[PDB]
Amino acid sequence: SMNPPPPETSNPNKPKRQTNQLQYLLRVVLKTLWKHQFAWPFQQPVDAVKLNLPDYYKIIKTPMDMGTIKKRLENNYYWNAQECIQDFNTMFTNCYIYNKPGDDIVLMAEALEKLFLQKINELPTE
Ligand SMILES: Cc1[nH]c(-c2csc(N=C(N)N)n2)c2c1C(=O)CCC2
């Protein structure tokens, strides 16, 4: 069994910015979700080999996780906040796509997503 390469966190020719919205995404949004008691299954890419989930990357073709997002934010990978918000939403959606309704992982994603929504509701103006 094999995992795919992880999503990139560095791309020197991709234009980048540091903006107040991106700073909020790191200092408020990421930090709030990262410390949560349910964050630990989303802090790195899904290891389909160790978890014995050979169908994970058959179904999930746009993987995303908070470890990747954290590195992207710390590395100033993004141009704008929408790119990062999209990454969080990809992470949550993948969980709902792969898993069964009511599974523990889905309840964990829902708890994190609730906080995500509350924080991005107050994304500062640029
Ligand atoms: C998003 C996600 N994370 C995990 C998981 C289990 S154990 C672990 N440990 C880490 N990452 N330290 N992550 C799963 C999952 C799914 O969607 C399907 C089932 C398993």
mmCIF file of C-alpha atoms and ligand atoms in Angstrom:
data_model
loop_
_atom_site.group_PDB
_atom_site.id
_atom_site.type_symbol
_atom_site.label_atom_id
_atom_site.label_comp_id
_atom_site.label_asym_id
_atom_site.label_seq_id
_atom_site.Cartn_x
_atom_site.Cartn_y
_atom_site.Cartn_z
ATOM 1 C CA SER A 1 0.000 0.000 0.000
ATOM 2 C CA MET A 2 1.164 3.561 -0.666
ATOM 3 C CA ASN A 3 0.218 7.070 0.229
ATOM 4 C CA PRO A 4 0.287 9.808 -2.404
ATOM 5 C CA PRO A 5 2.725 12.690 -2.152
ATOM 6 C CA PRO A 6 1.317 15.292 0.228
ATOM 7 C CA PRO A 7 -0.047 18.634 -0.973
ATOM 8 C CA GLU A 8 2.664 21.178 -1.643
ATOM 9 C CA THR A 9 3.486 23.755 0.996
ATOM 10 C CA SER A 10 6.171 25.621 -0.953
ATOM 11 C CA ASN A 11 6.235 26.829 -4.550
ATOM 12 C CA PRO A 12 8.776 29.579 -5.197
ATOM 13 C CA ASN A 13 7.220 30.790 -8.419
ATOM 14 C CA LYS A 14 3.713 31.117 -6.914
ATOM 15 C CA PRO A 15 3.114 34.801 -6.064
ATOM 16 C CA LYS A 16 2.572 35.326 -2.338
ATOM 17 C CA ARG A 17 1.350 37.926 0.139
ATOM 18 C CA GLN A 18 1.161 38.592 3.824
ATOM 19 C CA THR A 19 -2.164 40.326 4.485
ATOM 20 C CA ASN A 20 -4.092 41.117 7.650
ATOM 21 C CA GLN A 21 -6.738 38.575 6.650
ATOM 22 C CA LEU A 22 -4.122 35.852 6.201
ATOM 23 C CA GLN A 23 -2.602 36.815 9.562
ATOM 24 C CA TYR A 24 -6.035 36.354 11.139
ATOM 25 C CA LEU A 25 -6.362 32.962 9.465
ATOM 26 C CA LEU A 26 -3.151 31.882 11.215
ATOM 27 C CA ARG A 27 -3.372 33.654 14.575
ATOM 28 C CA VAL A 28 -7.124 33.135 15.159
ATOM 29 C CA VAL A 29 -8.583 30.482 12.868
ATOM 30 C CA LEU A 30 -5.808 27.901 12.576
ATOM 31 C CA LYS A 31 -4.681 28.346 16.168
ATOM 32 C CA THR A 32 -8.239 27.887 17.496
ATOM 33 C CA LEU A 33 -8.840 24.693 15.547
ATOM 34 C CA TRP A 34 -5.350 23.296 16.152
ATOM 35 C CA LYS A 35 -5.659 23.310 19.949
ATOM 36 C CA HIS A 36 -9.117 21.706 19.990
ATOM 37 C CA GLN A 37 -9.526 18.266 21.560
ATOM 38 C CA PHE A 38 -10.734 16.921 18.197
ATOM 39 C CA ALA A 39 -7.930 18.398 16.076
ATOM 40 C CA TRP A 40 -5.551 15.374 16.207
ATOM 41 C CA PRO A 41 -6.983 13.402 13.139
ATOM 42 C CA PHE A 42 -6.675 16.597 10.959
ATOM 43 C CA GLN A 43 -3.136 17.721 11.989
ATOM 44 C CA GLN A 44 -1.357 15.808 9.183
ATOM 45 C CA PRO A 45 -2.296 14.067 5.883
ATOM 46 C CA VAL A 46 -4.341 10.858 6.233
ATOM 47 C CA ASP A 47 -1.920 7.911 6.410
ATOM 48 C CA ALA A 48 -3.937 5.408 4.453
ATOM 49 C CA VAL A 49 -1.225 2.762 4.853
ATOM 50 C CA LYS A 50 -1.076 2.723 8.668
ATOM 51 C CA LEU A 51 -4.856 3.166 8.921
ATOM 52 C CA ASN A 52 -5.502 0.375 6.396
ATOM 53 C CA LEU A 53 -7.797 2.574 4.290
ATOM 54 C CA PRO A 54 -6.745 1.636 0.754
ATOM 55 C CA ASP A 55 -9.851 3.300 -0.681
ATOM 56 C CA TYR A 56 -9.167 6.692 0.954
ATOM 57 C CA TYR A 57 -7.191 8.149 -1.954
ATOM 58 C CA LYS A 58 -9.384 6.303 -4.442
ATOM 59 C CA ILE A 59 -12.259 8.512 -3.248
ATOM 60 C CA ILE A 60 -10.427 11.653 -2.058
ATOM 61 C CA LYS A 61 -8.587 13.266 -4.977
ATOM 62 C CA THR A 62 -8.035 16.697 -3.373
ATOM 63 C CA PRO A 63 -6.588 15.837 0.056
ATOM 64 C CA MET A 64 -6.150 18.565 2.625
ATOM 65 C CA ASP A 65 -5.284 18.736 6.299
ATOM 66 C CA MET A 66 -4.409 21.343 8.922
ATOM 67 C CA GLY A 67 -0.731 20.383 8.967
ATOM 68 C CA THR A 68 -0.563 21.412 5.326
ATOM 69 C CA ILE A 69 -2.576 24.567 6.000
ATOM 70 C CA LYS A 70 -0.357 25.483 8.952
ATOM 71 C CA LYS A 71 2.763 25.125 6.842
ATOM 72 C CA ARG A 72 1.186 27.120 4.005
ATOM 73 C CA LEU A 73 0.319 29.935 6.398
ATOM 74 C CA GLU A 74 3.712 29.882 8.142
ATOM 75 C CA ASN A 75 5.460 29.851 4.738
ATOM 76 C CA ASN A 76 3.242 32.624 3.282
ATOM 77 C CA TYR A 77 2.140 30.290 0.490
ATOM 78 C CA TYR A 78 -1.152 32.056 -0.206
ATOM 79 C CA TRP A 79 -2.055 35.168 -2.175
ATOM 80 C CA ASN A 80 -5.407 35.707 -0.471
ATOM 81 C CA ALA A 81 -7.644 34.555 2.338
ATOM 82 C CA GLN A 82 -10.106 32.817 0.034
ATOM 83 C CA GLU A 83 -7.407 30.325 -0.996
ATOM 84 C CA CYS A 84 -6.869 29.349 2.629
ATOM 85 C CA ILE A 85 -10.610 29.264 3.437
ATOM 86 C CA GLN A 86 -10.965 26.929 0.456
ATOM 87 C CA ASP A 87 -8.319 24.627 1.964
ATOM 88 C CA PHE A 88 -10.228 24.373 5.261
ATOM 89 C CA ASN A 89 -13.452 23.702 3.385
ATOM 90 C CA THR A 90 -11.750 21.012 1.283
ATOM 91 C CA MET A 91 -10.584 19.346 4.493
ATOM 92 C CA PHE A 92 -14.080 19.282 5.984
ATOM 93 C CA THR A 93 -15.755 18.228 2.750
ATOM 94 C CA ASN A 94 -13.324 15.341 2.244
ATOM 95 C CA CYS A 95 -14.274 14.025 5.660
ATOM 96 C CA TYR A 96 -17.979 14.173 4.842
ATOM 97 C CA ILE A 97 -17.419 12.625 1.386
ATOM 98 C CA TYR A 98 -15.401 9.651 2.640
ATOM 99 C CA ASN A 99 -17.093 8.812 5.919
ATOM 100 C CA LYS A 100 -20.503 7.626 6.984
ATOM 101 C CA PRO A 101 -22.949 10.051 8.613
ATOM 102 C CA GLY A 102 -22.525 9.969 12.385
ATOM 103 C CA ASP A 103 -19.020 8.456 12.426
ATOM 104 C CA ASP A 104 -16.735 9.804 15.147
ATOM 105 C CA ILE A 105 -14.522 11.535 12.589
ATOM 106 C CA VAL A 106 -17.559 13.345 11.159
ATOM 107 C CA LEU A 107 -18.606 14.597 14.605
ATOM 108 C CA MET A 108 -15.040 15.816 15.098
ATOM 109 C CA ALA A 109 -15.022 17.636 11.771
ATOM 110 C CA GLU A 110 -18.403 19.198 12.560
ATOM 111 C CA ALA A 111 -17.131 20.557 15.875
ATOM 112 C CA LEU A 112 -14.082 22.094 14.199
ATOM 113 C CA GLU A 113 -16.171 23.434 11.319
ATOM 114 C CA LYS A 114 -18.531 25.185 13.735
ATOM 115 C CA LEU A 115 -15.608 27.082 15.227
ATOM 116 C CA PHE A 116 -14.160 27.763 11.773
ATOM 117 C CA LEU A 117 -17.443 29.352 10.693
ATOM 118 C CA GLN A 118 -17.651 31.468 13.832
ATOM 119 C CA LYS A 119 -14.112 32.770 13.313
ATOM 120 C CA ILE A 120 -14.351 33.468 9.593
ATOM 121 C CA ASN A 121 -17.601 35.333 10.195
ATOM 122 C CA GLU A 122 -15.354 38.049 11.688
ATOM 123 C CA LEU A 123 -12.589 37.978 9.102
ATOM 124 C CA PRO A 124 -11.290 41.564 9.221
ATOM 125 C CA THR A 125 -11.608 43.922 6.319
ATOM 126 C CA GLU A 126 -8.378 44.151 4.314
HETATM 127 C C1 LIG B 1 -9.479 12.866 8.326
HETATM 128 C C2 LIG B 1 -9.166 11.523 8.957
HETATM 129 N N1 LIG B 1 -8.189 11.318 9.868
HETATM 130 C C3 LIG B 1 -8.161 10.017 10.261
HETATM 131 C C4 LIG B 1 -7.190 9.493 11.275
HETATM 132 C C5 LIG B 1 -7.211 8.321 12.067
HETATM 133 S S1 LIG B 1 -5.912 8.270 12.994
HETATM 134 C C6 LIG B 1 -5.240 9.629 12.572
HETATM 135 N N2 LIG B 1 -4.022 9.979 13.233
HETATM 136 C C7 LIG B 1 -3.392 10.983 12.986
HETATM 137 N N3 LIG B 1 -3.750 11.739 11.803
HETATM 138 N N4 LIG B 1 -2.335 11.320 13.924
HETATM 139 N N5 LIG B 1 -6.010 10.259 11.606
HETATM 140 C C8 LIG B 1 -9.156 9.356 9.581
HETATM 141 C C9 LIG B 1 -9.802 10.299 8.756
HETATM 142 C C10 LIG B 1 -10.929 9.883 7.846
HETATM 143 O O1 LIG B 1 -11.529 10.707 7.211
HETATM 144 C C11 LIG B 1 -11.230 8.444 7.716
HETATM 145 C C12 LIG B 1 -10.895 7.557 8.880
HETATM 146 C C13 LIG B 1 -9.588 7.844 9.614
#
